[PDB]
Design a binder for this molecule. Structure first.
Ligand SMILES: *[C@@H]1O[C@H](CO)[C@@H](O[C@@H]2O[C@H](CO)[C@@H](O)[C@H](O)[C@H]2NC(C)=O)[C@H](O)[C@H]1NC(C)=O
Lengths: 49, 40
């Protein structure tokens, strides 16, 4: 209760394992990102699609 | 970032001395007796 101000959509929630807020999840979903690090890990290109 | 050979993983957390990647750092600290450790 911050004087009537809500602050529910910018504070983190314990339900999500990433501990990100409601606005932050929408920000992360709106950007389609590739090459986030080492995802292929020298084995996935051997599984020739 | 790949797997680390030569340094063991401890459950303690300190400041980052040598950055490796993905929130994991390495440092040369005491154990007893001196060895390279890896930590978050
Ligand atoms: C503060 O924000 C929360 C959202 O985090 C509001 O809760 C929502 O209330 C509406 C009512 O119309 C429901 O339809 C939503 O499902 C609720 N969302 C939830 C629970 O995540 C809340 O009403 C806002 N205001 C206050 C005073 O808390």
């Amino acid at each position: 209760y911050f004087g009537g101000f809500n602050f529910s959509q910018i504070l983190p929630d314990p339900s999500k394992p990433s501990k990100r807020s409601f606005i932050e999840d929408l920000l992360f979903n709106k950007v389609t990102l590739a090459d986030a690090g080492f995802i292929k890990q020298y084995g996935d290109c051997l599984g020739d699609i | 970032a790949g797997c680390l050979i030569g340094a063991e993983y401890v459950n303690n957390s300190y400041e980052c001395d040598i950055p490796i990647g993905a929130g994991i750092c390495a440092s040369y600290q005491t154990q007893t007796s001196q060895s390279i450790i890896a930590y978050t």
